[PDB]
Amino acid sequence: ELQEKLIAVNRVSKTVKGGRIFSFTALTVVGDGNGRVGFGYGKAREVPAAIQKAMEKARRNMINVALNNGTLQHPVKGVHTGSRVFMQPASEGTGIIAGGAMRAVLEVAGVHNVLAKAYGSTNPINVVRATIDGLENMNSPEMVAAKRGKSVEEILGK
RNA sequence: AAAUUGAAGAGUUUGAUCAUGGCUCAGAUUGAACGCUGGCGGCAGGCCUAACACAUGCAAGUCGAACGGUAACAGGAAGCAG
Ligand SMILES: [K+]
Ligand SMILES: [K+]
Ligand SMILES: [K+]
Ligand SMILES: [K+]
Ligand SMILES: [K+]
Ligand SMILES: [Mg+2]
Ligand SMILES: [Mg+2]
Ligand SMILES: [Mg+2]
């Protein structure tokens, strides 16, 4: 039911009196392929434990995205820390034209066609955060009409 | 009718981190050259350097329906003779 993807595993270190203690971090995303997506970040002495923790957090941190037939509603910009991302809808058959970190998020969320670009820092943790922020801030015609007190036809008419 | 269907990142500074920042790579292209190799065909392309110097052959003639003419050769006309 839920598609899970491991985006990056990194080895970090802290120094103690006897020397360096290594550990691992895992960044993952989960999604239902129908507008729900979440990301998890886990730390452990071992890679499988870190990955399991990340999946556990991702399953709990899901948000909702208003998709339009497997594409975005409109161009969106997202930002987190040094990472800036830009995404726009594309015609059917275009595919996911995006870098790896954005691609995992978009694919588990269920975006099938999109043109994307990452500016600034391409650190995967912050790129994932910026991508999810843009998707969560995307608007749909229903929301726009409701908030403006108009009808969907008046929003998208002549 | 149709003739703007369009946008990917990665490595490297630290014990580790986030940022900044340069360097490096994956693409496409060429009047190309070199190394190894090499079956056929079609279409195109071929001194980018010395606007350096050039053997030899050819790259601008034609008109006798403008004209005086006859160097040929081809007849016509006169004579002679194997
Ligand atoms: K590391
Ligand atoms: K180095
Ligand atoms: K860099
Ligand atoms: K330094
Ligand atoms: K330090
Ligand atoms: Mg080192
Ligand atoms: Mg020349
Ligand atoms: Mg000639």
Nearest nucleotide from residue A121 CA, by C1' atom: B19
Residues A76 and A136 in one domain: yes
Q: Which nucleotide is nearest to A87 (CA to C1')?
A: B7
Which residue type does A114 have?
V
Task: Let me know whether A7 and A59 are in one domain.
Answer: yes
Q: Could you say which residues 21-80 of protein chain A have a Cβ atom less than 7 A away from any atom in strand B? A: none
Read out DSSP for A10-41? Answer: EEEEEEETTEEEEEEEEEEEEE-SSSEEEEEE
Q: Identify the H or E element spanning A85.
A: strand A83-89
Tokens 């922020």 identify what position?
A133
Experimental method: cryo-EM
Resolution reached, in Å?
A: 1.5
A155 CB less than 7 Å from any atom of strand B: no
Q: What is the DSSP string of A96-155?
A: EES-HHHHHHHHHHT--SEEEEEEE---HHHHHHHHHHHHHH---HHHHHHHHT--HHHH
- A155 in a structural domain: no
Residues A95 and A144 grouped into a single domain: yes
